[PDB]
CSV table of N, CA, C and O in Angstrom, one decimal:
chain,number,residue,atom,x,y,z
A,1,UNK,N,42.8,11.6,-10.9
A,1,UNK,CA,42.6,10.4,-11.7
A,1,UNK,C,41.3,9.7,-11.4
A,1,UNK,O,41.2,9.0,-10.4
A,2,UNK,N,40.3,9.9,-12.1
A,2,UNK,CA,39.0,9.2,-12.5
A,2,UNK,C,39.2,7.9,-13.1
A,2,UNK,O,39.2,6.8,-12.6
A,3,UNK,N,39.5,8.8,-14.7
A,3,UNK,CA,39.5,7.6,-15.8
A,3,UNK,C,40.2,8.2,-17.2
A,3,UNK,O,41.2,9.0,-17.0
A,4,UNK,N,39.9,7.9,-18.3
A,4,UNK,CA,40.0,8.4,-19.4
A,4,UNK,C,38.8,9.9,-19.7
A,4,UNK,O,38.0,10.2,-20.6
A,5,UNK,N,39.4,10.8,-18.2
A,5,UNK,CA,38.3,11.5,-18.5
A,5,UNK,C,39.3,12.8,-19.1
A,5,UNK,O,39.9,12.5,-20.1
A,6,UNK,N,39.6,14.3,-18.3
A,6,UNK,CA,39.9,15.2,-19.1
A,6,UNK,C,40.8,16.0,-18.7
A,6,UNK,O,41.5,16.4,-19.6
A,7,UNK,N,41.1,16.3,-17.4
A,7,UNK,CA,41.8,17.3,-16.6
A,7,UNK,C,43.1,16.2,-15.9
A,7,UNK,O,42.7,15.1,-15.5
A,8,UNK,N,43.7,16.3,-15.8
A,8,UNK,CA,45.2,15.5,-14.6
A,8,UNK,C,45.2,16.1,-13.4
A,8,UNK,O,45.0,17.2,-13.1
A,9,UNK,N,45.6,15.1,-12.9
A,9,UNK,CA,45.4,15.3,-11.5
A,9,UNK,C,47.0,16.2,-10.9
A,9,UNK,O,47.6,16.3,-9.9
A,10,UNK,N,47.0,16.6,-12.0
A,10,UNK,CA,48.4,18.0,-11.9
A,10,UNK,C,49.5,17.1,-11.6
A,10,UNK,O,49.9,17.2,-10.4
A,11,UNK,N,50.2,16.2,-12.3
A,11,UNK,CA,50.8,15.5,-12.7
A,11,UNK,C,52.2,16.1,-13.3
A,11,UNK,O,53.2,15.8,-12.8
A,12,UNK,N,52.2,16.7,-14.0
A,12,UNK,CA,53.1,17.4,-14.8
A,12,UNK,C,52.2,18.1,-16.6
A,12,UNK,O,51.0,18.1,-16.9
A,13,UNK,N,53.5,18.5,-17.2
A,13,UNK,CA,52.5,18.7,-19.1
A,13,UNK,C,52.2,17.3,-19.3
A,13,UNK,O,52.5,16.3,-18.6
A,14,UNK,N,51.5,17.3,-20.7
A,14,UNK,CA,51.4,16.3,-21.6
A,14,UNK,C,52.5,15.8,-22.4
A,14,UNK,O,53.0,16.9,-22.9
A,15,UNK,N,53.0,14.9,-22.8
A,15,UNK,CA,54.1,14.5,-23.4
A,15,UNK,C,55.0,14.1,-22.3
A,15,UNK,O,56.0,14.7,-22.1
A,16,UNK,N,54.6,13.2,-21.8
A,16,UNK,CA,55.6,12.4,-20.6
A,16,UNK,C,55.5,11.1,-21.7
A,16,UNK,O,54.9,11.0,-22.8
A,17,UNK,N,56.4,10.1,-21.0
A,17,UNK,CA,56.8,8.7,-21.7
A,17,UNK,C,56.2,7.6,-20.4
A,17,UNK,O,56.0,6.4,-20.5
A,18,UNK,N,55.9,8.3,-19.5
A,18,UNK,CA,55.5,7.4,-18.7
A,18,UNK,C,53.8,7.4,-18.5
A,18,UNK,O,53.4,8.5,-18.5
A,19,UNK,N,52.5,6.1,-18.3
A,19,UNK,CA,51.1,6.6,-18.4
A,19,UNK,C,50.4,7.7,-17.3
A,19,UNK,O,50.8,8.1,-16.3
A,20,UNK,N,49.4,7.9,-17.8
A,20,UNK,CA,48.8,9.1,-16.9
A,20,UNK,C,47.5,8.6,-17.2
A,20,UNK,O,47.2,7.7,-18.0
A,21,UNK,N,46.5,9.5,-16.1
A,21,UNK,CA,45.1,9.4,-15.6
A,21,UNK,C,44.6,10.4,-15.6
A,21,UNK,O,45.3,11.4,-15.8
A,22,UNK,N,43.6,10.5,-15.4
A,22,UNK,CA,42.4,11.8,-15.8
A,22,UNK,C,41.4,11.5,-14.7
A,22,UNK,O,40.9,10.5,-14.2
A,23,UNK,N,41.2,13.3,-14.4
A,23,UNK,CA,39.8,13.2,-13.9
A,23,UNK,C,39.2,14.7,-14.4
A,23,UNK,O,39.9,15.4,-15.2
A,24,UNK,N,38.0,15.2,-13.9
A,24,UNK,CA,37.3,16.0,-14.7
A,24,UNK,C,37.6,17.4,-14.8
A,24,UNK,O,36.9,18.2,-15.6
């Protein structure tokens, strides 16, 4: 987690209900 950048910091998929962060 950067920002509103591109890659996740391997968090889980996309489509959680809960927020997420980005980094490159």
């Amino acid at each position: 987690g950067h920002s509103v950048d591109r890659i996740p910091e391997y968090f889980g998929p996309p489509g959680l209900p809960g927020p997420v962060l980005f980094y490159s």
